[PDB]
């Protein structure tokens, strides 16, 4: 299962100034980038066009180009409409895309956050507020739902274009999607012991402190941290009394190793 996500971030500092920036992800790989500064969407992979022809892509990009300008003026008008209830600075985020399942199956979504809170989604044939949303949003919802052309376009994007596109991406990027990159580990301590694991792809990983045959209860896995080359980094810590270092090993299991675990004794 892969999730494809188009993430749009828009800031509106006042009546005149705004910028919109987007990135696109397929699982944990970036496929597209669209900076406010740029007229065109950039591919961040050789396979980012998926199985679309040049004509189909140029057409699709053109529609997004117009959308970015339309979105910007629609927010600014929506603010004037709510005035003085809401004012600048405003932050809007959109998360749109689809999750692909085995076979012919998928689910699409279009979630909207206002000032960092999820308030609105497209669902079925219309926009709706989600539970916990403030009631003033009902006027913008009513206004957005008056726009039949937008509704038909969004239904087509979510129901057809998105899954079709992603299926093409999955075939074109198979090689990169299924890359295996080997971790490299190293050890240190602070006045607790640390097993550093870096360079691995994909994400699933197993890091445990061992004394011989026996796994240590106390091992504390840190968060997964990214590297710039699209591999992952993780640390596992273990607190011990000083003097008890001797005979502890760090053990790492990862798909890339072909079952030859990394084993590092202190």
């Amino acid at each position: 299962n892969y999730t494809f996500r188009c993430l749009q971030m828009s800031s509106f500092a006042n009546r005149s100034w705004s910028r919109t920036d987007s990135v696109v992800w397929l699982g944990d790989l970036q496929t597209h980038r669209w900076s406010n500064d740029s007229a065109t969407i950039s591919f961040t992979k050789p396979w980012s066009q998926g199985k679309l022809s040049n004509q189909q892509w140029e057409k699709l990009q053109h529609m997004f180009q117009v959308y970015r300008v339309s979105f910007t003026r629609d927010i600014q008008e929506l603010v004037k409409m709510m005035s003085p209830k809401e004012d600048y600075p405003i932050e809007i985020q959109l998360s749109a895309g689809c999750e692909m399942y085995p076979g012919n199956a998928s689910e699409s979504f279009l979630h909207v956050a206002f000032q960092g809170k999820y308030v609105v989604r497209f669902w079925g044939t219309s926009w709706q507020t989600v539970p916990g949303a403030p009631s003033w949003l009902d006027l913008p919802i009513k206004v957005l739902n008056a726009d039949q052309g937008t509704s038909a376009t969004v239904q087509m994007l979510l129901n057809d274009t998105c899954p079709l596109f992603v299926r093409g991406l999955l075939e074109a990027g198979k090689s990169d999607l299924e890359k295996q990159e080997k971790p490299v580990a190293w050890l240190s301590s602070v006045p607790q012991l640390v097993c550093h694991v870096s360079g691995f792809y994909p994400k699933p990983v197993w890091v445990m402190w061992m004394r011989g045959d026996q796994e240590q209860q106390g091992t504390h896995r840190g968060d997964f941290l990214p590297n710039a080359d699209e591999t992952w980094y993780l640390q596992a810590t273990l607190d011990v009394e000083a003097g008890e270092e001797a005979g502890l090993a760090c053990r790492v299991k990862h798909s890339s190793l072909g079952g030859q675990d990394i084993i590092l004794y202190w």
Partner: T-cell receptor
Amino acid sequence: AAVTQSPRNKVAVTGGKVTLSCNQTNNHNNMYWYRQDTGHGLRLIHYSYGAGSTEKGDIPDGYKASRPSQENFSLILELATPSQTSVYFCASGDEGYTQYFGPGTRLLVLE
Amino acid sequence: TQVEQSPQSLVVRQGENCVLQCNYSVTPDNHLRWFKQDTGKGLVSLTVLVDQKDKTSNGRYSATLDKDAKHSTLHITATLLDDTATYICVVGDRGSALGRLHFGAGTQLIVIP
């Protein structure tokens, strides 16, 4: 959906105050003021998204707008100038795309 | 000026057909409306076209819209005296009140009785 305008026709002097009113009973949230001059399409001056709201349109200079109630939208020329000689059209609308036009007011500002 | 109409004016004899054109660069283009305005009067809506390729009619009036070409025509079949007026093309850039209207400057028709 019915929109009215008054006055329908007005002769005014440079530097006088002129008020042009528009009334609609459609319970429309939205109201718009345009002027039409020969050689040009209608051009948007001020508009309003409800009572107490007024917003600048494309050519707001020399005009002020007033929206005291759902029903009434006024265009006020605090210091009329000959360049404001024109035909003015008011319109109203709800959330949909249609604007319902008033019948027009002819204004002549003489020196 | 994003909405251009042609011709600027024309004179036709009662009973003759004529065709008026509207070309635009307004983006996006949700709908296109034609208005009739008699001299001294207000705007009467004749038709609105909303589809990618669209056709409408209203008595002796018909209209086409081609959004790919950003081009519309208004056809008046068998003109009458009361057709004397200015015909105005207007493009709405949204399917809601968030939209702005973009007005052509008009085409003036005169019909000879």
